[PDB]
Design a protein around this ligand. Structure first.
Ligand SMILES: C=C1/C(=C\C=C2/CCC[C@]3(C)[C@@H](C(CCCC(C)(C)O)CCCC(C)(C)O)CC[C@@H]23)C[C@@H](O)C[C@@H]1O
Ligand SMILES: C=C1/C(=C\C=C2/CCC[C@]3(C)[C@@H](C(CCCC(C)(C)O)CCCC(C)(C)O)CC[C@@H]23)C[C@@H](O)C[C@@H]1O
Lengths: 239, 10, 239, 10
């Protein structure tokens, strides 16, 4: 009926974690290869995605008990979740007012069209935008935003995971915190937790559609060369 | 395999 | 005592080749990750080097009878020569007035210091600058500049070459053209050809010192990740 | 091995 002590400790860690790995000014986007409006956005977007991965890794390392997993599983989880964790955190810059990620502009205002000039079809971009709007409409306290990413990341059924027992464990502990937080700290959170867990499955689907169109993109050398070593590594098949 | 990731995970 | 017909044809091809693969305005340097004055120049310089490789490949493909080699040897030659071909072509932007490559500025004016902020020691940069000044003092007609790169590239003793007989052949044919050109078209070219061939061996040495400090740079993942797929591929060990 | 180079050499 009230939040635990080991539960505040966890929430504090996760919010600080996200605070140190997400910039609301986006003041590193200048260091990326410029955006261009072939696949003119690919260089820029690949630089953006590569950058984000490094941040996700920063965040992940600060999720409680994550450093305690085997290096192998840590990799298995990053590799599988990475992309979803990004769609998640990107919502923070998504804008329903104009339906586009605004990290600046007109340079850094990414719309569905841009991601097209990077090798993706509208027939597959549509659901990602839909996912963004629904997520944005949930008006999440940052506590929930953070727990959601930390839970999404610890999702037990990732291809390549070994100790799926302890992973469902640290994710269950997190879910407790979330359900407790909404009930206790969120006025009118009756249906929220459910809606949130609903989002996770929207991600599995979005993740899939990506793996497909990225595979096709990564198999053309003229395109793969536009990527970064990290991207190639994280979305690669090596095991 | 996964040279960079290992490194990034201190 | 006068230039052949099959010899003008060759010179024409090589000059057009260099004309279509080298830009005197350097108007693509804006598309690179910005330069920064750790290894702040590495991202920019890696983008510059990657760009240059693609150009060298463009040039190489237009060298006469190069398309007639096996895909394997073409690779073996690019991999070994690439770096030297770059030091060669860079001279065109090097400036004795200020001893630095000026492709713009203050942004794109690269000095010895910059290449330091990219992972190389002065105790090894010194000879490259020396090589640039000597080369610049030879005041080469572009015909000679081009033949020099086309000869350097066809250098027979590259690690990994198979048909070293036909390669010494197409390079001998080129050398004829060069010696003929200087004697016939260059007033006071008595000692030139020799000085030029002298430069090639300066390159083998500069090439070596690079392979060493790049190996050390490429073995640290925090650094290799700053590179490009092409660089990694071209300076890699795969066979 | 040498995916990109092959491609770049038409
Ligand atoms: C990331 C962040 C930001 C935006 C995210 C975007 C905008 C551009 C397009 C992105 C990056 C989507 C694309 C990018 C994939 C390109 C690549 C790697 C070359 O296959 C993935 C979704 C592709 C689908 C599944 C829609 O087909 C996912 C999230 C989208 C900006 C800021 O919020 C930081 C955050 O950190
Ligand atoms: C290239 C071109 C230009 C400059 C060349 C430069 C300036 C920067 C430093 C460079 C690129 C040298 C370095 C770069 C190596 C960096 C890397 C790949 C991260 O290990 C190589 C020499 C290193 C030594 C041997 C000195 O230790 C070689 C030539 C130098 C500009 C223009 O002329 C186009 C040309 O096309």
């Amino acid at each position: 009926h009230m939040l635990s002590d080991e539960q505040m400790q966890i929430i504090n860690s996760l919010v600080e974690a996200h605070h140190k790995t997400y910039d609301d000014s986006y003041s590193d986007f200048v260091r990326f290869r410029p955006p261009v409006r072939r696949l003119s956005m690919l260089p820029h977007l690949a630089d953006l995605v590569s950058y984000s991965i490094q941040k996700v890794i920063g965040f992940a390392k600060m999720i409680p008990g994550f450093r305690d997993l085997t290096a192998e599983d840590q990799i298995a989880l990053l590799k599988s979740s990475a992309i979803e964790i990004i769609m998640l955190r990107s919502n923070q810059s998504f804008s329903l007012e104009d339906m586009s990620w605004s990290c600046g502009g007109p340079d850094f205002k990414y719309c569905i069209n841009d991601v097209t000039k990077a090798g993706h079809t509208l027939e597959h971009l549509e659901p990602l935008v839909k996912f963004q709007v629904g997520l944005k409409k949930l008006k999440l306290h940052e506590e929930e935003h953070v727990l959601l990413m930390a839970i999404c990341l610890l999702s037990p059924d990732r291809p390549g995971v070994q100790d799926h027992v302890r992973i469902e464990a640290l994710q269950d502990r997190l879910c407790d915190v979330l359900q407790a937080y909404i009930r206790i700290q969120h006025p009118g959170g009756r249906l929220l937790y459910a809606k949130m867990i609903q989002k996770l499955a929207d991600l599995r689907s979005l993740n899939e559609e990506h793996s497909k169109q990225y595979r096709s993109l990564s198999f053309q050398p003229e395109h793969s060369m536009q990527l970064t070593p990290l991207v190639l590594e994280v979305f690669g098949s090596e095991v | 395999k996964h040279k960079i990731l290992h490194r990034l995970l201190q």
